Design a protein around this ligand. Structure first.
Ligand SMILES: *[C@@H](C)[C@H]1/C(=C/c2[nH]c(/C=C3N=C(/C=C4\NC(=O)C(CC)=C4C)C(C)=C\3CCC(=O)O)c(CCC(=O)O)c2C)NC(=O)[C@@H]1C
Lengths: 162, 172, 162, 172, 172, 162, 162, 172, 172, 162, 162, 172
């Protein structure tokens, strides 16, 4: 699972080599950065409930037709599975924040994304728009390096979906 | 591969949950002690050769049968293999120590190792001992280094020990 | 040439991937660490002259016999080439300090070391003892994280020679 | 591979010298501006897809021949190759920008590239233009981002431009 | 690899004999029904994606545990693997259907498959069910297609079923 | 370019082997089948104009919102590029009919499809719905083995897009 | 075992792909061709007895010396093993006719042929002459596409032996 | 790889057009003559060994220098290479003949061939001649076979000749 | 790989000793008989094909089931495999005979061989017999050759036999 | 070209290694053996004329039918090309004798043998019988280690042809 | 274990080939050479005791300082392990003499030598000087081809250590 | 690969002839001097390390620019490459000396070597000189060795020189 720590260890191992000053300098970055990351994580964690309901709705407001009958934003089950899915994304964003890398996102959401979305007729556009909205609101929950971190990972998901 | 954070994340996910305030602060503490951790990993890297050498000198001091004909650290080829394994294990122990998790050690080094040695006729009890000696000296270095700020590293010395002890247990 | 920057870029390139938060966190470590590194570098740079003469002599004081006739610490040319060689090591130590990794040491001294030393009948023991001495004196030129950095690289050379 | 420090080191070594106080402070300044540099690289990474997409839309807006039969961005296979190359070049430009040196761009991407395209029949002038458009938009993003501290990034915007301009020049 | 003719030939050879007039006419009948067979294979190919998709929707409708954390079709990576396996099995069933013999299915797909899934922790009973759903829908399509000449395809629908049923039995 | 002829030749060549009765039997299939294929081709060719306008419109009738301002079914250029794209598909369908295989479709539309559609924000759903409509109308232009052929290739495109 | 059916399936499988119109067209060739093939098969099957005795004798008439003492066309066992061997060839010819490809010939007679014949001092010339004779007589048992099929496979054996 | 249809398609596409009624009927005619084509390809396959052998006997009858020491078809190793090349070329000519297009011959066999032979010291004029002899005998067989229906194959005999003549020209 | 000297050396080393005067003269004797040994190995090499052929003719004379359909030396493919194995075993027996030690035979040929044949359904008792026949004929040749100096080769004929007998025993 | 000298050099080179006592011992064998080899060579060289005519005839005496019209031992050109071919074999035997290995035989007669003989309808049996005869007569031209050498290489050709 | 016999067998096996005259000539070298080799072996064997004590001492006489306290030629255990080590070398020299190749030296002393010596702070110079001395004295125990053999292997060890 | 005999054979064959009595006795003489040849090859093998070392010491004594920064035998990596090349060339010269023919040297070592060095920026004149020094010392050893029988080795010393001189000429 990709973190700064696992990456430097992987690179050492693959050259049959003890960790050296290059690799320990790298690790210090990840540790120095934890405070901002983890502040973003705590804010995203406690606002999760509303961030999810905000983004879910915004998918319907931007794609009005989704909420008409015969469509995929209609009925309890679609709308339920949607909230859940955005919640999955926010969850892995917090994990990536806490972990010090994109690993959790890469392993649990990015690997396989398109195949799944294509089989199930899920448009990335919705998910990008959910995330664009989450990005708008996270502008006033955080600032400074915690915001930059939150942004880094939200944007990472948006690029994964384009 | 896991580190101490990644481990937290996997357990959280298996609940379907954002990390518990419990788990959050356990990880905040790991960040709190991370400079000490870097010194501890650095202590091993900076003395790797001597740690292996000194462990070695002492292993064969105790077990003079290994360096007789018939013995598993004879002739030069076998001694070089034994010295190499000492380095490999010390290496994965240092990786675990940077990571705050034993998994890289268990998955890339310890998994299958005992059965390898038995297939080879390599006396596992002697290998376990060589690991115990590396532990003594490695921790020696973690505890008494060049102009590091004075403080308490016993938590980290314990954790390093458990990695040495995992390896020993797994192999004997 | 191995630095934190080149390492993360190498790892991105080899997966056909833009630099992400994992890789930029790593880079911040290298940049945050530059101050201590570069203080060590400046101190080692201006004391070079004496650090070299100190270590050269210590090789003869620890291996007295080297300075007798018919030996490899005798005559102007051996003693000249010795000072030069320790000077090469200190030079690459400062480079490794400034560069943020072992690259300069790996590429210019470690790659090929044993073959060369073996063909020319140069014992590593001398060089280890030169470096052990340099390490003793650098104890009072630096302290804190600059000393740790100086140490990291001196020790790296000693392990390369064992 | 070189970065801006490594470059200094290579030039120093060719003199047989410890780094000049001249060179030292040039590098101290690079460390001084490194947070800005990280934001600049982050600006590109965070908008890579749109930078390529927007460059693309505009390239074919201008050069409607490429998307006709007979054209080098027709049929889907060729368009995907062209979109892929836009990404590859934007990628090595971002690497150069983290490094403070063009070498990774010149050595891994630009070296031989023109002769490849000519062998293929790929119109190099169109490729140069696609690179010019990526530059416009990429710098746009470097200059106007999400809640970054206000200051002057023009030095870095220039340097990014020269990497885009190197690529363009090398290819046309 | 065998087809229905090749199978005949192998059994004849084991007797040391030219094909029996018995076996000859059994094969003449296979040629007789071959246009229908081609339509049947074409029915599956022409709706492969929907057959997998519809089987899938229904599998997870029934077994909502697979898509919870802890479940074997969670997260995206695992769902993609599960969707991929559904396709692989539907593919070898269609090959068997063109061939008039199960061997390609048994030899290239089913052989070892159960033990793979058990090693992986993949719930074989759920995989068996996904195969049962593919069967329902696939046969649906074999029986009700676009402007095919009206006639009786029940013999072929049975045979297709046994290939689906072989796979299910082999896996559960 | 994949045709029955190229496939059997490829398989012979790769075993360093003259074409044998297995391979010539195969070729006879492709030649025997040409009549139905080429009837489908001629019918799809002369109706092209209306098949394209029919499918284009159906994309807007099934996705009404596309034709509102700010959307991708609005303005002369979007609606022009749409007709063109469906026309490309019908063109390659006729080519695949005439060629005796999916080659023209594989090489000119399938290879790269998703990457292109994803960069340009083109939903496969439109294209599937264009093709579903074309399939409805081709029900009464052809029958028997020419219809089966037309269907084979239309369906092949729909599966490529799912 | 090489048949048109196995070949197209092999080619699909190796590209991880469902059978498409290219592959089904191929199969139709093999099925359309079965009637001529199987007529050849039935004629070769019922005449087997005499086709074999005719060819066996012709080997001795063309190589008179074979039937003298000390030679390999002398005594019950050689002459018995000869009839058997030609019978094996005719048997696999009928199998190849029925199967829709050279598979049975490739797997049971061609693979290993020369090594065996070389160890046992069996000249291909005999076998070619057996087959040339069988080809002469099959001229009046069949005609049209059944004869062409019979010929295809007889000639295939003769080329395997040259 | 191209065949005669694929060639039509590529030219049509370069116009951005559905196939012309011109091109359609040219291809309808190829389907019209396809049974004859199959017999023509079959004529070559069914006599490949003799075609090569007879060409060979005659090549060395004419050019007795090749089989002397110093000659390019001496010793056994070189003769086997020469016999092998005769087969390779006859093989790609038969492929072109099934395809109705020379491209497989030009792309997989003739491209670079002359420069190979010159590098090797293989006399290209002798190789050209061996190809001319294969042509004579191959066409012989195309024209006078076992119980094929009587008709006119001259169009196909010409086309086969041009493939033999392409190869000869390309090599000499 | 071992030869008769190498074997001596390994046993000496396991004692930690220079070779015993016992072992020295045993090896001096091997050098004494080495011309005979070379003739014995040469006897096998010079008649390898006939040794295999004659063994073969006789194996199938005895066991006419192997050459019926259903039999393990039917069809041509299987007979060629069986002839090939006869050669492989005769080859490693000749290597052992040059070496004065069975190890190359046991390590490269006999190790796992029985279990291979059982997996394949190859009747091991028939393979053992084919080896017994090779032995009879091979020794025949070792004993009655072209203008070799007259003397006693029975010691070497025995030793060759034990290599044939090792193989037989190992396989049956 | 395989000789004892080339073999040991090849084995050294491929391990990046100077020739050592193992390899020089080997070479001494080849040099010690030259006398017997070269005596065989001189005897085979001067008797070549008659050895060839003896073996040529023996091919016709053992295969009487070859010399009848329509056969391959008839007419000046066949009988001429035969003498030549046996002469080639004896020539390479002398070369192999002189060279200290089978190289000349491997490179100029064995590589390609069967393909050539099979295309030209040349039976190995003739050539084996030519060589068996040459082996009979060389029994009284040589003795001791020169005969053993001559035999080694004649037998090597006979095994190459079986 | 590398001997002339194992080498030729290895080379045959790897080409799937019976031993031929090339390989048997090689073997004759090894057998012809055994007498000189084994005379060297017997002389080195019975003088072992003194050859070892002579070389051990010479290491101290050439590196006087080794025998001072705190050094590696001091105390019973160092001086004991030294005698043993030279004894190992002489032992493997005799083995290599008897075996007909460097195998015993390659497998038991050369493979791994430098790694071991480097970890244990053992200078090759000592061992070279032990061997140079052994070479001086073996000048008067042997002569002719036994001396050349002894020399070959002593020199082989000296090159392994440089 | 050629040796002196193989060379004779190739020239004879190009005439279509059994070896001339001329050529026979030239080769009889090579066998006559072969013990001396073995000592000469042994002289080089037995002092390879010193020959390279001594050549090296002297090369850099003369050309102190190579060991300055900017110089082609600086830093350690380049010196190791240069020492390695000295060994490679000495190795192929010894092979040629065992063979009595330069071909292995020309084909495996010298062919392309000059153009390699020029591409690399390696000063060929310095490499030529290093080869001249190896020659001086190597021949020194060929002429003055340990208890070899006294005689005249000048013919062999010349021939060794021409191999050293070939290499030098080829490279400079
Ligand atoms: C010139 C090449 C010779 C020749 C050919 C010729 N062929 C036919 C007719 C047919 N040939 C076939 C052959 C095949 N069908 C297949 O599926 C395969 C692959 C296994 C082959 C080889 C068939 C089916 C026919 C039609 C049936 C028939 O026998 O008539 C003709 C007749 C005209 C036509 O085009 O059908 C001719 C003239 N004719 C010659 O004189 C040349 C020596």
């Amino acid at each position: 699972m990709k973190t700064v720590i696992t990456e430097v260890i992987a690179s050492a191992d693959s050259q049959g080599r003890f960790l050296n000053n290059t690799e320990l300098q790298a690790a210090n970055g990840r540790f120095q950065r934890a405070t901002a990351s983890m502040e973003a994580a705590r804010a995203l964690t406690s606002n999760a409930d509303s961030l999810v309901k905000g983004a879910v709705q915004e998918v319907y407001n931007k794609f009005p037709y989704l909420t008409q009958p015969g469509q995929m934003g209609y009925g309890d089950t679609n709308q339920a599975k949607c909230a859940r899915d955005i919640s999955h994304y926010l969850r892995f964003i917090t994990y990536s924040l806490v972990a010090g890398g994109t690993g959790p996102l890469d392993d649990y959401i990015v690997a396989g994304l398109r195949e799944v979305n294509r089989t199930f007729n899920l448009s990335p556009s919705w998910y990008i728009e959910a995330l664009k909205h989450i990005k708008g609101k996270v502008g006033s929950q955080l600032s400074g390096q915690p915001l930059t971190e939150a942004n880094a990972y939200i944007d990472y998901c948006i690029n994964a979906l384009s | 591969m896991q580190d101490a954070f990644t481990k937290a994340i996997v357990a959280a996910d298996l609940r379907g949950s954002f990390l518990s305030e419990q788990e959050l602060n356990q990880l905040t503490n790991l960040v709190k002690e991370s400079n000490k951790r870097l010194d501890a990993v650095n202590a091993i890297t900076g003395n790797a050769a001597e740690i292996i050498s000194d462990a070695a000198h002492k292993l064969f001091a105790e077990q003079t049968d290994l360096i007789r004909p018939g013995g598993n650290a004879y002739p030069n080829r076998r001694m070089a293999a034994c010295l190499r394994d000492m380095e490999i294990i010390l290496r994965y122990v240092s990786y675990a120590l940077l990571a705050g998790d034993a998994s890289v050690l268990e998955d890339r080094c310890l998994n299958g190792l005992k059965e390898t040695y038995v297939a080879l006729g390599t006396p596992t009890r002697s290998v376990a001992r060589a690991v115990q000696l590396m532990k003594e000296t490695a921790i020696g270095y973690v505890n008494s280094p060049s102009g590091v700020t004075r403080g308490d590293c016993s938590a980290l010395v314990n954790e390093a020990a458990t990695y040495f002890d995992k390896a020993a247990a797994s192999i004997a």
